[PDB]
């Protein structure tokens, strides 16, 4: 069960945030962690394209170097806070999984700034409830989280000692094909 109280971002500035460039996962919070060890690396990008509102997903897994992606039209709940009916599909956007009734996330911009930001995310697949993810994000994939998204953190009542980071894990990523997905 996710929670639905995470706060938007006050004063959330929507066009600098979904201006269809790559945002980094850096370091996240699983509140409950898959019971096989999966330490993944993700990216995503988000703006318009031809008149919608787009995200694209990308996941690495450094074990094998499989890759998985995703894109979906977004559809805005009330300021900052999203959904996504996701399909997913390979770095060419042929479908692998349609869009389905049961399979959707929701997510909320709870801090964002030129460089950082930071959401809650949650996941349903097969009509279950996944749980809750919050991630930091960052233009750039080798950058520290600095103090203002640390703040936000704060302001959200967790700690960023329980966040795990990708930061020396052997994270490749795609850009240009998680770009061009928006598009698909
Ligand atoms: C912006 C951050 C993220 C978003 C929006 C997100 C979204 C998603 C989505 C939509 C799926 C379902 C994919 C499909 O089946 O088509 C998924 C699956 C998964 N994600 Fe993420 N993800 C995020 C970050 C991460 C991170 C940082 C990890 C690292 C542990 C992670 C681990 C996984 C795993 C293990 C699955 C497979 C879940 C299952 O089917 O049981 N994700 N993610
Ligand atoms: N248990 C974490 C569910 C998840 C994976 N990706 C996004 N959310």
């Given at each position: 069960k996710?929670?639905?109280?995470?706060?938007?971002?006050?004063?959330?500035?929507?066009?600098?945030?979904?201006?269809?460039?790559?945002?980094?996962?850096?370091?996240?919070?699983?509140?409950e962690?898959?019971?096989?060890?999966?330490?993944?690396?993700?990216?995503?990008?988000?703006?318009?394209?031809?008149?919608?509102?787009?995200?694209?997903?990308?996941?690495?897994?450094p074990?094998?170097?499989?890759?998985?992606?995703?894109?979906?039209?977004?559809?805005?709940?009330?300021?900052?806070?999203?959904?996504?009916?996701?399909?997913?599909?390979?770095?060419?956007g042929?479908?692998?999984?349609?869009?389905?009734?049961?399979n959707?996330?929701?997510?909320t911009?709870?801090?964002?700034?030129?460089?950082?930001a930071?959401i809650?995310?949650?996941?349903?697949?097969?009509?279950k409830?996944?749980?809750?993810?919050?991630?930091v994000?960052?233009?750039?994939?080798?950058?520290?989280?600095?103090?203002?998204?640390?703040?936000?953190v704060?302001?959200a009542?967790?700690?960023?000692?329980?966040?795990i980071?990708?930061?020396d894990?052997?994270?490749?990523?795609?850009?240009?094909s998680l770009?061009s997905?928006?598009?698909?």
């Open positions: 996710c929670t639905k109280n995470a706060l938007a971002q006050t004063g959330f500035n929507k066009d600098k945030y979904f201006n269809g460039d790559v945002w980094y996962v850096t370091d996240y919070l699983d509140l962690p898959d019971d096989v060890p999966k330490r993944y690396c993700a990216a995503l990008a988000a703006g318009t394209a031809s008149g919608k509102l787009k995200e694209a997903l990308y996941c690495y897994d074990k094998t170097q499989d890759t998985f992606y995703d894109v979906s039209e977004l559809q805005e709940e009330s300021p900052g806070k999203y959904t996504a009916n996701f399909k997913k599909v390979e770095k060419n042929n479908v692998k999984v349609d869009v389905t009734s049961g959707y996330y929701t997510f911009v709870m801090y964002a700034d030129d460089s950082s930071l809650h995310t949650c996941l349903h697949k097969g009509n409830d996944l749980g809750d993810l919050y991630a994000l960052n233009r750039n994939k080798d950058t520290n989280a600095g103090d203002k998204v640390k703040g936000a704060t302001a009542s967790l700690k960023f000692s329980d966040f980071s990708t930061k894990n052997k994270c490749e990523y795609d850009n240009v770009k997905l928006l598009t698909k």
